[PDB]
Amino acid sequence: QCVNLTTRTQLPPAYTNSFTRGVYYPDKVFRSSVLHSTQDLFLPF
Amino acid sequence: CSNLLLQYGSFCTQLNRALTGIAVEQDKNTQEVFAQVKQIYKTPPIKDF
Ligand SMILES: *[C@@H]1O[C@H](CO)[C@@H](O)[C@H](O)[C@H]1NC(C)=O
């Protein structure tokens, strides 16, 4: 079963600066010492 | 179309490099022709030549 929770305190939504975060590997190929370019769904810096 | 052009990439990088070289060369040409000197002389007020 589930119980609704009561003890709460609302605050304005917190915001933060995400800088140079949210980068993942594009494929599963071993590339070394190469500057590669790509386009995908990425988190903007 | 931009996504498809992305995987070429080096081609128009090369093109832009060539055109920038041409433009720099044009500025070089004008400078080497006209900027032979650097002391900007001016004519005297009297034209007693
Ligand atoms: C409270 O719980 C009931 C059922 O457990 C649910 O129907 C209801 O949506 C809940 N209300 C809130 C504000 O959580």
Swiss-Prot record, chain A:
Glycans are attached at N4. Changing T6R: In strain: Delta/B.1.617.2, Omicron/BA.2, Omicron/BA.2.12.1, Omicron/BA.2.75, Omicron/BA.4, Omicron/BA.5. It comes from the Viruses. Binds to host ACE2. RBD also interacts with the N-linked glycan on 'Asn-90' of ACE2. Cleavage of S generates a polybasic C-terminal sequence on S1 that binds to host Neuropilin-1 (NRP1) and Neuropilin-2 (NRP2) receptors. Interacts with host integrin alpha-5/beta-1 (ITGA5:ITGB1) and with ACE2 in complex with integrin alpha-5/beta-1 (ITGA5:ITGB1). May interact via cytoplasmic c-terminus with M protein. May interact (via N-terminus) with host bilirubin and biliverdin, thereby preventing antibody binding to the SARS-CoV-2 spike NTD via an allosteric mechanism. Attaches the virion to the cell membrane by interacting with host receptor, initiating the infection. The major receptor is host ACE2. When S2/S2' has been cleaved, binding to the receptor triggers direct fusion at the cell membrane. When S2/S2' has not been cleaved, binding to the receptor results in internalization of the virus by endocytosis using host TFRC and GRM2 and leading to fusion of the virion membrane with the host endosomal membrane. Alternatively, may use NRP1/NRP2 and integrin as entry receptors. This is Spike protein S1. It comes from Severe acute respiratory syndrome coronavirus 2. The gene is S. The chain holds residues 14 to 58 of 1273 of the full protein.
